[PDB]
Amino acid sequence: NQSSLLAEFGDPITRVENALQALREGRGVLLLDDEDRENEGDIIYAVESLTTAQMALMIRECSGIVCLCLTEAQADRLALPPMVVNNNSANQTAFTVSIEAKHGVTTGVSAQDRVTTIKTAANPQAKPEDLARPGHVFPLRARAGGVLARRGHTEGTVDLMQMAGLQPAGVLCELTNPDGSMAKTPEIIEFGKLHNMPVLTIEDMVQYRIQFDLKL
């Protein structure tokens, strides 16, 4: 079972603290959501330290739909409303209109171009005109309150950044097996071991936030 498998990454508190220190060091982490929800592991990177190599790993090891998790305030600053007026997706995944850097990219899809787009979007002094729409990067609006308001990878991403003391923007993508099926805990554990990436769950995060009275 999951809890028993994750044991080798430490106890739940250790699992959170290792994830936070990985992010501070510029490394990625792998975040599992609830078993009865998606039961998927996403690679998470802090935008602050995002490299082309990190992006390239996501593209070749994950779904390739690399999303940029943003606070409401940052999404607002960039004038990125929800893609649809009435979201009826299974998880209410908060996709905004898709984006591309207006300047400094070609087709938008290379690892370099996605990073350029993401860095442009995450710039504290970005304006809406810095991004063309539509494009190949997929921003997501994180819920105010984070994982204590919504138990998604979107909130997990942003909460991790804030908990780590980093700028509150991260990227995510779902780890996918070569045959096209989604990675499960065993494969996720293996991937984290291969790539020196801490693994943790949303429940780890929730329990950690509760214990340490963490408003973010």
Next chain:
Amino acid sequence: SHMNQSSLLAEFGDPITRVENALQALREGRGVLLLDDEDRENEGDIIYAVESLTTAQMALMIRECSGIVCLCLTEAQADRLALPPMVVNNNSANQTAFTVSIEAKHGVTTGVSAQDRVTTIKTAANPQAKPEDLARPGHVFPLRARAGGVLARRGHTEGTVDLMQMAGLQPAGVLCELTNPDGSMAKTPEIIEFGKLHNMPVLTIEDMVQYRIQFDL
């Protein structure tokens, strides 16, 4: 001396032959690799007929391409599904005609596995589909092909729908951009090798344009 692209593509035949082999591969359920103009994107996209799309084919795209797998549709089919342009004022470099993204309602879970994307695509491409069959947003990205195909707009979008129509297949195909492990986009020699290894013909939009000119006009 490096030969030009046309010279590299010569082993696939002359322009017309390259299109004819593409059409036949699609009729046999195999994919093709379509290059656009060198002064446009200069990118090769894997293209598959939705009619014969399998989970294995989709898995290949996720593994070997950008993973942003797009569903090229006719304007008629997009309107049938009530899929408006994602943004009213499109200012992307090529005005790539993204609609709002989609997900099938039944038969899927999170929408992102190879099998889920296929289910979603099959659902959308069905000639008797209704808007309500598709949740929005989702993990499949439809594109509105321009009326007139590659003689009107020289995009992989139009190339896909033209290819299906010319092959006599359901006028819906899926595309995705071939990518190298280091995250750079695959270029002609890599596209050609990939095509040889996967038994997928390689062709260009210009080949398709010349074929339509010579075979229709």
